[PDB]
Amino acid sequence: LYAPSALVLTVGKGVSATTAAPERAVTLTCAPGPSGTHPAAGSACADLAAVGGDLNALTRGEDVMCPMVYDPVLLTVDGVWQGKRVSYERVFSNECEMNAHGSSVFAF
Amino acid sequence: LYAPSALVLTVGKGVSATTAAPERAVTLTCAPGPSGTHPAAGSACADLAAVGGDLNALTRGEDVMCPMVYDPVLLTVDGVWQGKRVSYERVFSNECEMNAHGSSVFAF
């Protein structure tokens, strides 16, 4: 047995789970190994591990430059990270911004 | 694009998400096809489809017989079923009981 690490991330244009339909959704597994529908299971897993599973501490790439659009996107993440239950959601100003937090966690 | 179907199911001995640590956790994908860490991705997918994604309507196999133990187990399911957000959790009297609701959805 190992502490489980399994998550489902969903993104949709909107500003809250009540007003943003889930357009895309990927599963992500990091224990015992990185797998799932996520485009970059490996790097995503590494992104989370480095930050200690703390989604909120994923940094915004200083050099990454995004156009100043205001087209909100709601990101949700649910499941278990190393035996601990996860339930997170954040609204980004635009996808480019979302995809700029952590190299590959949210880039799906 | 297709309406997404991606879920994470977790089970732990306890009676509420606050008091039941996630011991095991499996991801399940049903669109465009059945996949994930779930032991029976295919049948599980079929179990859900038949019931219209309505977890609460999964039936208890009339013939399935379980010993009368009282060792509760909390089952949680989160994610998206056919474009609609899912967030469900139910406490069973014992694993044998949990595994008796729907042939293979919860049998993991």
Question: Any idea where the domains of chain B sit in the sequence?
Answer: 1-108
What is d(CA B104, CA B17) in angstroms, rounded to the nearest whole number? Answer: 22
**Hey, is the C-beta of A39 within 8 angstroms of any chain B C-beta?**
no
Burial of residue A91 (number of CB atoms within 10 Å: 0-12, 13-18, 19+): middle
What is d(CA B81, CA B75) in angstroms, rounded to the nearest whole number? Answer: 17
Cα of A13 to nearest chain B Cα, Å: 13
Q: Judge whether A56 and A97 are in contact, CB under 8 Å.
A: no
Question: Phi, psi (5° rounding) for residue B28?
Answer: -140, 125
**Hey, is the C-beta of A45 within 8 angstroms of any chain B C-beta?**
no
Please name the method used to determine this structure: X-ray
Query: Hey, what are B55's tokens?
Result: 């977890």
Query: Hey, what are A106's tokens?
Result: 């949210």
Please, where are the H alpha helices in chain B? 41-50, 95-98
Closest CA to B48 of B91, B2, B9, B94: B9
**Hey, is the C-beta of A14 within 8 angstroms of any chain B C-beta?**
no
Angle value at C-alpha B91, between B90 and B97, nearest 5 degrees: 105
What is d(CA A63, CA B94) in angstroms, rounded to the nearest whole number? Answer: 53
Q: Which residues of B touch A23 (CB under 8 A)?
A: 1, 4
CB atoms within 10 A of CB A67: 8
What is d(CA B7, CA B43) in angstroms, rounded to the nearest whole number? Answer: 14
Q: Which residues of B touch A36 (CB under 8 A)?
A: 27, 36-37
**Hey, is the C-beta of A60 within 8 angstroms of any chain B C-beta?**
no
Resolution, expressed in angstroms to one decimal: 2.3
**Hey, is the C-beta of B56 within 8 angstroms of any chain A C-beta?**
no
- Whole-angstrom CA distances from A10 to A31, A78, B5 are 20, 9, 10
Q: Judge whether A35 and A102 are in contact, CB under 8 Å.
A: no
- Structural element, H or E, at residue A75: strand A73-81
Architecture of domain A1-108: 2-Layer Sandwich (3.30)
Would you call A24 and B4 a contact, using CB atoms and an 8 Å cutoff?
A: yes
Nearest CB to B25; choose among A17, A36, A79: A79
